[PDB]
Design a protein around this nucleic acid. Structure first.
Lengths: 98, 104, 94, 79, 95, 103, 79, 104
DNA sequence: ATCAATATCCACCTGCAGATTCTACCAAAAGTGTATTTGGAAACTGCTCCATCAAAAGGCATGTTCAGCGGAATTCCGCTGAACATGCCTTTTGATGGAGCAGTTTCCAAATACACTTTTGGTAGAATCTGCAGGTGGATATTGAT
DNA sequence: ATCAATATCCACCTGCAGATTCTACCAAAAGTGTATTTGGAAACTGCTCCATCAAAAGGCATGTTCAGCGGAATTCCGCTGAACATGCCTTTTGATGGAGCAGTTTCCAAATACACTTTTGGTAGAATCTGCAGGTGGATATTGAT
């Protein structure tokens, strides 16, 4: 058999996803999530499909950027593996945990 | 048209109208819509120029969202002006922290 | 009913800088948000400027200071350059 | 739960685009919690604009306005 | 000297209602005056936009209310809304 | 009979109405807007003064000073968030030392 | 060269108020650089308001408006 | 001569903690007034000549500048501790400004 | 360094979803011409507070010595994530009633708008007031050496 | 644990700057009372486009296994915190000349306010067109074992 070493495929994936623009979370699951949360604020609602899309574009850009800062925080601690403590530090400094 | 007298492609009259209907002030001078229209046009020209180049660099003739993102993030000034803005379907700039590269 | 947008004007400028380049729908929509966003930012700062100075009128002078306050260096320089050019040309014309 | 619909592979892809090479197993649940807070904040505001307009349909503009308020301006769906 | 106004006498009244024997320094009062003005602006700003987004030329109590809901967090919003509604209703009952 | 009186408020309805017009927030301002807005402002002022007064009491003082305003707002989750991007001059910060730093 | 009036002891005090127990020797120059940028940005805007008003005196309000523009609202000096 | 007992000496960290407690308890400005004023004057001057300053304007700048630096040291401190250190370094300040959106 | 399992790349081809040119259409702009009104600049200048110099004094900054302890480099174990391939269940895609967004029209409660009568929040300022800053001395820790 | 060197809590004390003050002038504001204009809630309605259901695409859930990463433990040296001596320069308190901010009356260039006519940007069902996504072949670069 052939078997790539740890990190090689991951590095390949980074190059591939940093190259494309397509949404990375599947539509339906996401759509279900949006409606579930919305139901807690007002019942029997409908959504323009463009509204769910706007929310997905916004949420992914947000997670991707947070991921970027999370990576910087892990590297700051001389690691190359992101952990919960890294996301937390990034969010607190961002004022999201103010 | 007022845009003609000003030598602009952007709608001076529309800008005037939007300024009044925007409740920005009780009154709006005649030159404000012209000045504003010109600024809007210049900023538009600036981004289309860089995005067009981005398209040419990708062997493509039609500007798509990705090209606008590339034009903005690669330009120091535009990136700053649009620092808290998300360009839908724009993706991100290729970038990998050096420490994650395979140890040569 | 209607629904205005800066699309035809963005396109006209597109042909001035890249006559051979086209632009997709989604890309045009992004350009529309961009023009609207900057219009609001500039008008907003002009509005405050007049209010701070107990003035009831927004003139090109308010637009110019707003531009100086909102745009980064060079961008500000050229925008001011363009603005002043358009007012001059506008005035010097029947 | 629907939040689990946001799978490990989808979260991994987001991380890769964010330039991440190695991911700890506890990252998946942590990420879901963050996505949930993010959506709750934006949806809460969008729906508030919806109710104010007396509608039963959340519009793209409602989302764009909510996003603007939270300082997350989005281009491409209006304003 | 064109008189420059502040909310100082009203802050003072309210202060006396919650802490009858407590005073306030001029610096503290100056901070309270910036606080009131700031919230006035944020709420009015949000009401202004709300009206525009819906093609309405009038800012009514309903606009202030949604504005208060978009602006203040949880419990503050609930209580504010309550006092707001209360005052309008009372204002209407008279004359 | 003042509009503040009619609405059962201490804050100035008349002034608020006026301020809403000169702020040029909309073409017109309905009569219930200033009432509601004055009510909210009065409530938020009462909320912060209640907490600041307590902070002054805890420091054995009778006069509220900026530090008390800062203690009241930073120790309260909601006021802290509402004023999250705000700086209170002469307010200092809350005493807080990270654990690993203690001996 | 007035940036040197921001002394090592003054910077240490500010760090203590910020809960800092240990300070590296390179922090002082780094802090002066960060303060200089902060001041330049704020003064820049404050002086722009001064000129827009045709005054030669920077007022407390000019600074307050400059601070507000940069998302650093200040209470205590006029708003 | 009786000297078997050395002069009293606090251990490193003890006075630094005493300092954090004192400064977190008070609210006075920590940077010297006249020196800070000269800095504001110097910087302003390189922007526009012949400017005058209300003294409350200088004070506003000083209250804003010190709250900004105090809060930045807080984040810097969390960045050092995150790296399992207890000493802040230039790299922590830099990481904090980076995540804050002040440089990238 | 030598294959060899795979990923990556370039030149070419083509169907088709999304872009484009078209004649037509009209409410909504946008521009023109006229009459009325008013914001805010110019000129005069009262009066604020800003720049500056003066002189004395101490609280803070500067510069040095000295050694505890924290940062950083090296080593190394074992816990855990990355690669992979087996197997299928959820997501994606295309079709169709009905909810509700949105366009149109009626008209009453509600908000401008100009006139005055009246109350009141600034403020100049005077006076008398009063909480607490800051110096103090003594009771209670808090540290660090042994 | 015991103890000496300091730091810290602290209630009592009291003059002083900052607060509460009040006689009184008042221009401005806020309130009362019609008269006139109108925004936008209501009710009816046509039709986008959204939720739902059947069906075909294809990404995710799983367990195995081990490469390599996280961090515990040990070590070494250099840097940074504590203490100390010296004396500079910030702070404090006044005084003062006058730059320039801010109030006031004058007056017109410029803006609002309709009324009237030409024009354009948006919508649309129709027809035509086309940049490039994605699939094929074949070359060659990349990675990982030996």
């Amino acid at each position: 058999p052939h078997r790539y070493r740890p990190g090689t495929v991951a590095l390949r994936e980074i190059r591939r996803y940093q190259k494309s623009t397509e949404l990375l979370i599947r539509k339906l699951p996401f759509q279900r999530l949006v409606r579930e949360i919305a139901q807690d604020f007002k019942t029997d609602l409908r959504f323009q499909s463009s509204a769910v899309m706007a929310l997905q574009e916004a949420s992914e850009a947000y997670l991707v950027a947070l991921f970027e800062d999370t990576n910087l925080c892990a590297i700051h601690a001389k690691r190359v593996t992101i952990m919960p403590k890294d996301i937390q530090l990034a969010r607190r400094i961002r004022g999201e945990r103010a | 048209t007022r845009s003609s007298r000003a030598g602009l492609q952007f709608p001076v009259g529309r800008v005037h109208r939007l300024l009044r209907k925007g409740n920005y002030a009780e009154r709006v001078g005649a030159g404000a819509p012209v000045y504003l229209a010109a600024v809007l046009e210049y900023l538009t020209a600036e981004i289309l120029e860089l995005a067009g180049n981005a398209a040419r660099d990708n062997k493509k003739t039609r500007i798509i969202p990705r090209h606008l993102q590339l034009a903005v993030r690669n330009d120091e000034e535009l990136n700053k002006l649009l620092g808290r803005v998300t360009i839908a379907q724009g993706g991100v700039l290729p970038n990998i922290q050096s420490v994650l590269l395979p140890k040569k | 009913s209607r629904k205005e947008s800066y699309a035809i004007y963005v396109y006209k400028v597109l042909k001035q800088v890249h006559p051979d380049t086209g632009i997709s729908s989604k890309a045009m929509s992004i350009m529309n948000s961009f023009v609207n966003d900057v219009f609001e930012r500039i008008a907003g700062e002009a509005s405050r400027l007049a209010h701070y100075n107990k003035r009831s009128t927004i003139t090109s002078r308010e637009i110019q200071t707003a531009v100086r306050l909102l745009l980064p260096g060079e961008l500000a320089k050229h925008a001011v350059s363009e603005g002043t050019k358009a007012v001059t040309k506008y005035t010097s014309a029947k | 739960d629907n939040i689990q619909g946001i799978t490990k592979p989808a979260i991994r892809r987001l991380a890769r685009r964010g330039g991440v090479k190695h991911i700890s197993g506890l990252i998946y649940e942590e990420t879901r919690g963050v996505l949930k807070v993010f959506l709750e904040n934006v949806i809460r505001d969008a729906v508030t604009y919806t109710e104010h307009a007396k509608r039963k349909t959340v519009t793209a503009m409602d989302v764009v306005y909510a996003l603007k308020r939270q300082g997350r301006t989005l281009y491409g769906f209006g304003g």
